Amino acid sequence: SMQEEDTFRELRIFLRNVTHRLAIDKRFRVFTKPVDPDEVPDYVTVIKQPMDLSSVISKIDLHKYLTVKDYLRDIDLICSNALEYNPDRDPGDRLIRHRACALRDTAYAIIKEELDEDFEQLCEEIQESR
Amino acid sequence: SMQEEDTFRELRIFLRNVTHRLAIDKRFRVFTKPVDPDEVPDYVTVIKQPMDLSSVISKIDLHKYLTVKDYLRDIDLICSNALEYNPDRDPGDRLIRHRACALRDTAYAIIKEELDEDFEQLCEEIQESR
C-alpha cells in the first residue's frame, strides 16, 4: 500500500542520513569501502560476510532494510568483522578495534536519540505482515 | 571504559619513565623543582605559567595528560619560560638557555624513538570523544 511504501521511504531517508554521517567521520574511513581483494587477499579467507558503509548504502537503495533493527544488524557486522580480523595486542590493531566499536556505538546512539519508537514499531509490523 | 582507562594507564607509565630520565640528568637539575618564591621573588611577576618536572609528575598522577602532545606542551613551557626569564648575553644565561633547549630536544627525541604513533593516535581520539 502507498502508506506502507511511504513509511519505508521515510526509513530510507533516515538511514542514508545516519550512514552519511558515519562515512564522513575521519575515524571511520577504513570502514567506508570494501577491502581491496589484492591488498588483502586473505580477507575473504577469514571473513565470511564482508560489510562496509558503501555496501550498506547499496542495500538501502535496494529496499533491503525494512527496519532499523535490520540496518543495525549490518553495522554490528562491520564492527564484529574488524574485531575478528584485527585481534592482536599491537597498537595498530587496538586503534582499529576502538574505531570499530566507536562506529557501532555512534550508530546506536544516533538511533537512540533520533528514532521514534512508534515509527520503528510500525516498520516492524509491516515487515511481519510480509 | 576499562579499555580506555588501560590505554591511559600505559601512557602514564611511559610519561613517568620519560620524566624520571629527564630529572636524573645533571644538566636539567635546575628544571626539576619549582622556583623558590623567596630566592626569586620576581619570578612570579614575569612568568605567567610556572612549570617544572616535579609538577609534571603531579599532573601525570592527576590524570591531567591524555596525550603525549599535552605532555610535550608542558615540556615546551619549561623550555620557553627559561628562555624568557634568562635572556641575557652573559654566559650564565646562555648555559641555562642551552640546558632548556637540550631538555626539550631530549624529551622529543625520546618520544620520537619510543612512542608508537598508533598508540598516540588512539589516545588522541579517546580524548576528542570526551
Binding site: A102, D105, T106, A107, Y108, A109, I110, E114 | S129, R130
Partner: peptide, 5 residues
C-alpha cells in the same frame, strides 16, 4: 545526540 565518539 551521537557525536562524542
Amino acid at each position: 545526540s551521537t557525536g562524542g565518539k
